[PDB]
Amino acid sequence: MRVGERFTHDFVVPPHKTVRHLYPESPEFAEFPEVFATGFMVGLMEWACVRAMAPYLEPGEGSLGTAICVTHTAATPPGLTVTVTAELRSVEGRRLSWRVSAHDGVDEIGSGTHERAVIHLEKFNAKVRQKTP
Amino acid sequence: MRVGERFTHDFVVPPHKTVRHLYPESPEFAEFPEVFATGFMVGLMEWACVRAMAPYLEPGEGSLGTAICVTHTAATPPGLTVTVTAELRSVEGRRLSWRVSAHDGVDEIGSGTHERAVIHLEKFNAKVRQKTP
């Protein structure tokens, strides 16, 4: 995988990606503005990086997000398209670091870096299984 | 409120907070390990700071997250209890910074900082509706 290689992702924001929907179990969130949730924007940014890396993975390799550091600087009601751009900034063998940005066609909405680590799935899923109650 | 003040809350991770559930619509996520999603960890930390903040707002006032900078270094299967601590780091006018921290009773799972901005709800909402299609 090459440093400086870019992927963009477009996603039209539906009603069910707002703050209320990340945690429908939260009375505290239930009267928030109907805007695209930070945790969902995080998910969309991760997803772009998962897609860009996919065809570089060996069978039975997967990957996990190990860090997210971004601003969220404008709000987006449902119906606008959020475009996420991922650019790969470094690879360490196992460890990739992406610069991610997103806009919603109207404003720049957020900026930063996401990081992930390539894993061996079977033996990752063994180790998680050993802390599963 | 006071700088240094900590608020804590716990959350038994249910089966529906894993990666595949953050974006049910994503075929690329659909077969990921069954572990707690970063975007749901982000949300749960925001929720800690919303709760802490809530006694100090006037009516019609809210907050929105404007930055998150966190690592996620251990994976959490459903069943475990995720304890999240938010400690107030600063207040500058309508802006607050939190130190946020999470462990699942077994591992420390993530930490870092989170910034929020206090907003006037009626005003924000009316501006938001104006970029709505």
How does DSSP assign B54-69, residue by residue? GGGSPTTEEEEEEEEE
A102 is in an annotated binding site: no
Pairing of strands A95-103, A61-71: unpaired
Within 8 A by CB and 6+ apart from B29, the residues are A47, A50, B19, B20, B22, B23
Binary contact (B124, A33; C-beta < 8 A): yes
Compute the C-alpha angle B109/B110/B112, nearest 5°: 165
Distances (CA, A) of B80 to A21, A126, A132, B14, B43: 22, 16, 7, 9, 17
> Resolution of this PDB entry, in A?
2.1
Phi/psi of residue A93, nearest 5 degrees: 75, -90
Distance CA A115, CA A112 (A): 10
Which among A64, A101, A104, A118 is the top mutation candidate for probing chain B, defined by the most B β-carbons within 10 Å of its own β-carbon? Answer: A64
List of domains in chain A? 1-133 (3.10.129.10)
Distance CA A68, CA B42 (A): 9
Give start and end residues of each alpha helix (H) in chain B.
Answer: 19-22, 38-53, 121-130
Question: Among residues 17-46 of chain B, which lie with CB inside 8 Å of chain A?
Answer: 22-23, 26, 28-29, 32-35, 37-40, 42-44, 46
- Burial bucket for residue B69 (CB in 10 Å: 0-12, 13-18, 19+): middle
Which helix (H) or strand (E) is A97 found in, with range?
strand A95-103
Binary contact (A28, B47; C-beta < 8 A): yes
Which among B22, B70, B113 is the top mutation candidate for probing chain A, defined by the most A β-carbons within 10 Å of its own β-carbon? Answer: B22
- Which one is catalytic: B21, B34, B38, B115? B38
Q: Which residue among B29, B42, B66 places its CB closest to the CB of A73?
A: B66
Distance CA A80, CA A68 (A): 23
Distance CA B102, CA A49 (A): 24
Phi/psi of residue A94, nearest 5 degrees: -75, -15
Q: Does B60 touch chain A (CB under 8 A)?
A: no
Q: For tokens 């190990």, what's the residue?
A: A66
| Residue whose C-alpha is closest to residue B79's, from B4, B130, B8, B18 | B18
Binary contact (A76, B33; C-beta < 8 A): no
- Determination technique for this entry: X-ray
For residue A75, the chain B residues in CB contact (below 8 A) are 64, 124, 128
Distance CA B126, CA B11 (A): 34
Query: Do the Cβ atoms of B46 and A38 come closer than 8 Å?
Result: yes
